[PDB]
């Protein structure tokens, strides 16, 4: 169909939770020139455990990435809308689930 | 629904609930947003600890909006993390 389109006018700089979290993370650039957007910043948990009250890595808990399913554009004149999974940040999980 | 793909929302020290943000004039119409259950984080004994805070991790995502359409950049909470005032 006639689309007749019109043209109109880094996570470290927007948020620092990556450094302040008990499950801290680093951000890595996933580059792809044949994909829109070309650069995607992915969160990678710094530690297996979480940072406890004394500042040590505690292995009674785990840093895990929170992954979000996002639609991305790819070249395949022709394009394809692909569903990709990206790590936005990390959270701390424990094996004991409490009620409160 | 994110509850069926992942259960970190219930196992995190900064747990969260998922709320449906409905909009028929936006594509997609339904967006599941994470809302932290507590202000504090769940400590080693199972209590809400206020020496730390549950905070949402927000992601900037492109969404479609209303023959004519516009591509808008929106911010969504994917989940929660636990932050402390002491950085080690």
């Amino acid at each position, epitope marked *: 169909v006639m689309v007749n389109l019109n043209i109109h006018n880094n996570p470290k700089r927007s948020s620092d939770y990556y450094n302040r979290s008990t499950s801290p993370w680093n951000l890595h650039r996933n580059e792809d020139p044949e994909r829109y957007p070309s650069v995607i910043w992915e969160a*990678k948990c710094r530690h*297996l*455990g979480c940072i406890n009250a004394d500042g040590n*890595v*505690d*292995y*009674h*808990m*785990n840093s*895990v*990435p929170i*992954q979000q399913e996002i639609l991305v554009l790819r070249r395949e004149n022709s394009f394809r809308l692909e569903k990709i999974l990206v*790590s936005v940040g990390c959270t701390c*999980v*424990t*094996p*004991i689930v409490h009620h409160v | 629904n994110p*509850k*069926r*793909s*992942s*259960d*970190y929302y219930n*196992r995190s020290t900064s747990p969260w609930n998922l709320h449906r943000n409905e909009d028929p004039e936006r594509y997609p119409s339904v967006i599941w947003e994470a809302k932290c259950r507590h202000l504090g984080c769940i400590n080693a004994d199972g209590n809400v600890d206020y020496h730390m805070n549950s905070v949402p991790i927000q992601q900037e995502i492109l969404v479609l909006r209303r023959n004519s359409f516009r591509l808008e950049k929106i911010l969504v909470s994917v989940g929660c993390t636990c932050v402390t005032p002491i950085v080690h």
Partner: antibody, heavy 118, light 111 residues
Framework: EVQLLESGGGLVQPGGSLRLSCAAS????????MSWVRQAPGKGLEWVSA????????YYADSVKGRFTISRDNSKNTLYLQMNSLRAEDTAVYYC???????????WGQGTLVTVSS | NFMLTQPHSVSESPGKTVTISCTRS????????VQWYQQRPGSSPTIVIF?????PSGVPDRFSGSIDSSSNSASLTISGLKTEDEADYYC?????????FGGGTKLTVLG
């Protein structure tokens, strides 16, 4: 209800290869670290390998390093264990296990028998 | 790496309290969660205790877990011992890389 169903076991010649599968259901598979544990007949439980929920981190017992590969398909809810260069000492019932965190196993599968014999 | 030492067997009478110990060779035991599994003949292991002292539903109140920092050992306690408690018991723990099981303990209910 948590279900872990192992497949792929059987007879393998020494120096041979075999791939085990574990089909999981009753839980959100991608948010759980998974493990392989083996038991030779009339002997104790021996940890083999572990993999994080995302598949980004893998761990191996010294006795299987280089020869085995743990992997997972989160869209298929399947855990795999690729075994290369098999030896008689690898003969065991192989169990698939669900972990709440790394090293905390909460559920076990029924096992699949692997026999390494000429 | 590290090892976990368990007694090869333990024998007690019905209604008595039995303790199975698990001693860690290296690394602080209190830094990593201890699990305990029961294995009946020709069966898959089942969890009795996870995360040092957590008892899943279906596991009788008679089973309890504890840890001792000074002795670097974990214990599985069974109070009000029953004939149905005969089985093999394995302790298990980990470090940032490895996962280790103890050698196992054959529990014999006497008389």
């Amino acid at each position: 209800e948590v279900q872990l169903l192992e497949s792929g076991g059987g007879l393998v010649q020494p120096g041979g290869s075999l791939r085990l599968s574990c089909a999981a259901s009753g839980f959100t598979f991608s948010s759980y670290a998974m493990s392989w544990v083996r038991q030779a007949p009339g002997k104790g439980l021996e940890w083999v390998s572990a993999i994080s929920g995302s598949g980004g981190s893998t761990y191996y017992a010294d006795s299987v390093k280089g020869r085995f590969t743990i992997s997972r398909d989160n869209s298929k809810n399947t855990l795999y264990l690729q075994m290369n260069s098999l030896r008689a000492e690898d003969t065991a019932v192989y169990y698939c296990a669900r972990d709440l965190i790394h090293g905390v196993t909460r559920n076990w599968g029924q096992g699949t028998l692997v026999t390494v014999s000429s | 790496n590290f090892m976990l030492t368990q007694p090869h067997s333990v024998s007690e009478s019905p209604g008595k309290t039995v303790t199975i110990s698990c001693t860690r060779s290296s690394g602080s035991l209190a830094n990593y969660y201890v699990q305990w599994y029961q294995q009946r003949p020709g069966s898959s292991p089942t969890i009795v205790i996870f995360a040092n002292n957590q008892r899943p539903s279906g596991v009788p109140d008679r089973f309890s877990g504890s840890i001792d920092s000074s002795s670097n050992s974990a214990s599985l306690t069974i109070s009000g011992l029953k004939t149905e408690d005969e089985a093999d018991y394995y302790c298990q723990t980990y470090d940032p890389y490895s996962v280790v099981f103890g050698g196992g303990t054959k529990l014999t209910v006497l008389g």
